[PDB]
Amino acid sequence: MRTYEDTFSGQRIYPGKGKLYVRGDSKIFRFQNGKSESLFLQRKNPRRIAWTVL
């Protein structure tokens, strides 16, 4: 057992939660909930979202 961090927002991820995404260029993204990936697939910049860790 281990924990991961959301790629878009930095929230902690526990086993069985979130999703795993693999893009065409063989890049791996991890998400913790539906809010993160809906913003990621909308081409939003994480540096302008006020609640992200980054």
Partner: protein, 387 residues
């Protein structure tokens, strides 16, 4: 003429009478076969259903694909405050069946059980067992010891009367529940002696059941009001251009059968039926006094099994509990009934010895992200309200 293309029937005729259950409390119909060489022991328990959560463990199944790797499974939590023994019953064999001939009660009864015998308790006089209590301390209880001698003489099976302490749960109800539990033991004299010694005493669930044991659960399922054929039995929907409704059955019978038959799907009541689900497994029996009952061998965090913010539409568990793999019939707060198994297990999958590795305690009221409040405080930092 014959049917064009073959297909199996919809639904099953085994559970055919789809009417509301006669009684709210689940009813046990059979008990495990008696063996007079085992020590005396009870064979049932009863408790209340809290909720579900997620666990993580590693698998031990040689030859499988997921051998020696971690898996994720769902479990269920049952609240189990201790029970109190109230009396015992005896039965005899007759050419028409079994029948009871005697029963004896204890001297003092709690106000929980006395509520069960009344429908308007507030304006009553509460004289339930007042005249019966005088049978004690009268000729040194000569009347009572005569009935106990009768059961030792004419009876073949003995059961015990027990009730729950609903006052130790967050439930609003104050009326307790009463049932009978059969005693399987060495001898009829041993059965009565063991049963009589337990009057007005508490019994904990750890004495009845033990870890990794295969049990059965009996309860009443969730109810739905009044449903059509499409959801009740699961028939194909009619085309979009159908007049006078399209959620029905097109043909309900031939001509000279001449009556609508008992095997055709029709609308009616769904849910709230009595059901018996078998072959469930026990992962862990947790004690209520322990303050670290949700910890494991590898995760050393000190925490209890109640999630953050408590179970939804339920309080928090402060008593003992049992963790059961899978799903069981029944909504939250409903009374459950637990029974020892009738089968014989030699499957090498029911003989597995389970050891847990992690237990989820995140909030189920949303997309919870943290286990405890201290862990959340460290990550979050400090807030304005913290002054």
């Amino acid at each position: 003429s014959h049917r064009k293309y073959e297909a199996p029937r919809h639904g099953s005729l085994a559970f055919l009478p789809r009417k509301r259950a006669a009684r709210h409390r689940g009813r046990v119909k059979s008990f495990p076969k008696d063996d007079p060489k085992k020590p005396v022991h009870l064979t049932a328990a009863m408790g209340y259903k809290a909720g579900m959560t997620t666990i993580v463990r590693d698998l031990d199944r040689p030859g499988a694909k997921a051998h020696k790797k971690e898996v994720v499974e769902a479990v269920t939590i049952i609240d189990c405050p201790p029970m109190v023994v109230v009396g015992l019953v005896g039965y005899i064999e007759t050419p028409r069946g079994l029948r009871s001939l005697t029963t004896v009660w204890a001297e003092h009864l709690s106000d929980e059980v006395k509520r069960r015998f009344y429908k308007n308790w507030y304006k009553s006089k509460k004289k339930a067992f007042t005249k019966y209590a005088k049978k004690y301390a009268e000729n040194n209880g000569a009347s009572i010891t005569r009935e106990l001698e009768r059961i030792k003489k004419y009876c073949t099976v003995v059961r015990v009367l027990a009730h729950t302490q609903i006052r130790k749960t967050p439930l609003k109800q104050k009326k307790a529940h009463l049932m009978e539990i059969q005693i399987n033991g060495g001898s009829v004299a041993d059965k009565v002696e063991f049963g009589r010694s337990l009057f007005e005493k508490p019994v904990t669930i750890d004495t009845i059941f033990e870890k990794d044991e295969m049990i059965d659960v009996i309860a009443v399922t969730k109810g739905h009001g009044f449903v059509g054929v499409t959801a009740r039995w699961g028939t194909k929907k009619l085309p979009r251009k159908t007049h006078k409704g399209l959620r029905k059955v097109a043909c309900i019978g031939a001509w000279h059968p001449s009556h609508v038959q008992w095997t055709v799907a029709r609308a009616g009541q769904m849910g709230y039926h009595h059901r018996t689900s078998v072959n469930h497994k026990i992962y862990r029996i947790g004690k209520g006094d322990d303050e670290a009952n949700a910890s494991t061998e590898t995760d050393l965090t000190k925490k209890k099994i109640t999630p953050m913010g408590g179970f939804v539409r339920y309080g928090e568990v402060n008593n003992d509990y049992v963790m059961i793999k899978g799903s069981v019939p029944g909504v939250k707060k409903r009374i459950m009934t637990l029974r020892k198994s009738l089968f014989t297990h030699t499957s090498r999958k029911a003989l597995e010895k389970v050891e847990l590795k992690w237990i989820d305690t995140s909030s189920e009221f949303g997309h919870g992200a943290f286990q405890t409040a201290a862990e959340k405080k460290q990550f979050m930092g400090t807030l304005k309200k913290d002054l």
